[PDB]
Structure 1
Amino acid sequence: RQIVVGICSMAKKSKSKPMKEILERISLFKYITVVVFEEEVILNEPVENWPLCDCLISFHSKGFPLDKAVAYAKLRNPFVINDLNMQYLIQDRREVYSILQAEGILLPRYAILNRDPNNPKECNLIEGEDHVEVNGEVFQKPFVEKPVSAEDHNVYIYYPTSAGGGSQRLFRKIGSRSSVYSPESNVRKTGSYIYEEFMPTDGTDVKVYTVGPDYAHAEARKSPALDGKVERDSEGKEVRYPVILNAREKLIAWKVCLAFKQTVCGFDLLRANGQSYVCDVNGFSFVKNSMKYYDDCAKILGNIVMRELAPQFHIPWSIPLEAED
């Protein structure tokens, strides 16, 4: 029989252009059949009624019942490409940074301000006009303030008096804009946050996309922190700049992929002061508008499936060569 690769995610993701491009390519593997789980089934059917698969590609996004996906994996024991339990931890910036630190991965100096919503003023925060002190640790402006929820994209940057003060409020893109300047110079007074040192880059973020620990595609985009106007090409797509990762960065990708147990994993790098710092790990993410990435990603994923399962299915398989970017 065929090896069944099940895809379990919200319809917005399962029916996205990059997903469809990759799945049509995985389907070219002679012994692989792809089954995409319907959103109505994921949401409303018990896991006992979900389709069977031998290999499961499943990931959380807004509205996704991660508890059910975990229960399905426990019930059916498929080969899991992106670990499901780690997807709880990827939703919490505190957990993400804790893992990065434990892997010896360079990241911005940071401190966690945990605030009790019942007693918001009893937390260990002291504020001056050009700095904050978080659990005693001093952050001179410029510094960055991130909600502890990794799903909350309201990241603020606070400017020093020497630069005019105020703040840059970032958010999920709304059309032409990804951030806006605010004259507010004082930090947020409700919620829990990570405070971290601002890393000076050339004005771009490096976005890294892994497919297993030995393949990573990278590209750069204008930092939303800069002025907040999104750069677009004549075709209306956001401008992307070419990147080739250095040896240090290829190792970072290897580490992130394995540490979070996410075969397919996106993360952000800040190239600053002659090193590269991880500031965000997003989990499952595909590159868009690259035919070569679609070819590479599908081949790698198919090869992973075959390597793991071909012996069980008595299918002859010789491990092929694979790209690194």
Structure 2
Amino acid sequence: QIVVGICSMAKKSKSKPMKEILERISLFKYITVVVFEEEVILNEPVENWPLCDCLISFHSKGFPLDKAVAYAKLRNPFVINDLNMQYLIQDRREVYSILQAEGILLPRYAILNRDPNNPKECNLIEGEDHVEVNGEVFQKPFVEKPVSAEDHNVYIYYPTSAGGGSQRLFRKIGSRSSVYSPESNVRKTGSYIYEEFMPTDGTDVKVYTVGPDYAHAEARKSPALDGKVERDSEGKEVRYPVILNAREKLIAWKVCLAFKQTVCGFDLLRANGQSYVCDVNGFSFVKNSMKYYDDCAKILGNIVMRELAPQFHIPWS
């Protein structure tokens, strides 16, 4: 049997999307799925972790990535989502830097790094209707993101012509994803990426790859629009159908390969006749789509089989 190891926090390992997918991967005749217990992940040295031939593992809050890396180094499994890239995925500066290098369209941006030691020694000048970040001008509206990709406190600053003030996004709480603030001045402590605001039709397109040749997309109301979450009958955020164009499929292919995340979530902004990548989140499943559960499990199982069947002497075509 080929052993597929699943190594992530229990929150993720026991989520419905995960359970739906693992159950289908298990229908592969030569595959056995082992889900590492959270207790073992956090408290046992890697030497005691289960063996696997293929490792599916990803960082979310609380996950000891260092131990996942050390485990993979010890056992040398076939790695579905590269572990070291997951340090970089946590850092918007590194994410954006990879996108530029791969020739992927993204918003014009500039990084403001504030060294925690110095009192006031940053490269930032603020006007009423713009900022200058290391000399680079951004007219409002512009977007201000914490350099930590796990920090979802993204601010949008409105131009005086639109009434000034700001929109503060956050991790969804109930009916809301953002709120208006009369505050017009940028945040004064911490490091941030500043970027041009890309005018979309008020939705974000969310893309989910499973390998570089398969990508499901769907749209959701932009959190910055007014902050009210559209919910269905069952209190799940309303999603709208999307079909990617040729440019966007190529984008999905590049993102999946550039970050070495077979399973990969990222966000597109359809603006000005193009599509811009504004966020790459790594390992991420589509929810509430039976067909995605089927495709994803099938693709992953196929990848596993293609990769490992020869050394296991299993016929596979």
Deviations for 1:47-90, whole angstroms, at most 9, x for unmatched residues?
Answer: 00000000000000000000000000000000000000000000
1:244-288 Cα offsets, whole Å, 9 max, x none, are: 000000000000000000000000000000000000000000000
Give, in whole Å, the separation in 2 of the partners of 1:96 and 1:309.
31
User: Secondary structure of 2:168's partner?
Assistant: strand
Deviations 1:19-40 (A, max 9, x none): 0000000000000000000000
Q: Which residue of 1 aligns with 2:294?
A: 295
Aligned to 2:86: 87
Q: Quote the offset at 1:114 in angstroms.
A: 0.3
1:235 CA drift (Å):
2.3
Which digits, 9 at most, give the CA deviation of each residue in 1:99-138, with x for residues without a partner?
0000000000000000012225210000000000000000
Q: 1:64 to 1:219 in 2, by over 3 A?
A: same
8 Å Cα contact 1:120-1:189 kept in structure 2: no
> What SS does structure 1 have at the residue aligned with 2:131?
strand
Cα distance between partner residues in 1 of 2:286 and 2:151? 22
Task: State the shift of 1:237 in Å.
Answer: 1.2
Closer/same/farther in 2, CA of residues 110 and 215 from structure 1, 3 Å limit:
same
Query: Aligned equivalents of 1:235 and 1:126: distance in 2?
Result: 47
CA distance in 2 between counterparts of 1:195 and 1:11 reads: 35
Q: 1:265 maps to what in 2?
A: 264
Deviation at 1:162, TM superposition (A): 0.1
Provide the rounded CA distance (Å) in 1 between the counterparts of 2:115 and 2:183.
Answer: 23
CA distance in 2, matches of 1:53, 1:169: 43
CA distance in 2, matches of 1:75, 1:148: 32
CA distance in 1, matches of 2:243, 2:187: 37
| Partner of residue 127, structure 1 | 126
Give the TM-score, by structure 1 length. Answer: 0.97
**What per-residue deviation string (whole Å, max 9, x for no partner) do you get for residues 134-175 of structure 1?**
000000000000000000000000000000000000000011
SS in 1 for 2:188: coil
> What's 1:137 paired with?
136
CA distance in 2, matches of 1:236, 1:153: 21
SS at match of 1:310: helix
Which residue matches 2:313? 314
SS of 1:133's equivalent in the other structure is strand
Answer whether contact 1:211 1:264 (CA < 8 A) is retained. yes
Give the RMSD, CA atoms, in angstroms.
Answer: 0.5
State the Cα deviation string for residues 213-242 of structure 1 (Å, max 9, x = none). 000000000000100000011222110000
Q: Percent identity?
A: 100
Could you list the structure 1 runs, at least 4 aligned residues long, displaced by more than 2 angstroms after superposition: none
Residues 166 and 184 of structure 1 are in contact (CA less than 8 Å); yes or no, is this contact kept in structure 2? yes
Are the counterparts in 2 of residues 146 and 195 from structure 1 also a CA contact under 8 Å? yes
Structure 2: gaps of 5 or more residues = none
Aligned length: 317
Instruction: Report the CA distance shift for 1:213/1:120 in structure 2 as closer, same or farther (over 3 A).
Output: farther
Cα distance in structure 1, aligned partners of 2:304 and 2:28: 10
Contact kept? 1:120, 1:190, Cα under 8 Å:
no
Deviation of residue 305 (structure 1)? 0.1
- Give the SS at the match of 1:293: helix
Deviations 1:279-300 (A, max 9, x none): 0000000000000000000000
TM-score relative to the length of structure 2: 1.00
Secondary structure of the residue aligned to 1:104 is coil
Q: Is the 8 A contact 1:156 1:167 kept in 2?
A: yes
- Number of the residue aligned with 2:62: 63
3-state SS, counterpart of residue 169 of structure 1: strand
- Structure 1 residues 144 and 120, CA, compared in 2 at 3 Å: closer, same or farther? farther
Partners of 1:239 and 1:281 lie apart in 2 by: 21
Change (3 A) 1:120 1:93: farther
Query: Which structure 1 residue ranges, 5 or more long, are not aligned?
Result: 319-325
What is the match of residue 187 of structure 1? 186
Does structure 2 conserve the Cα–Cα contact (< 8 Å) formed by 1:143 and 1:196? yes
SS at match of 1:312: helix
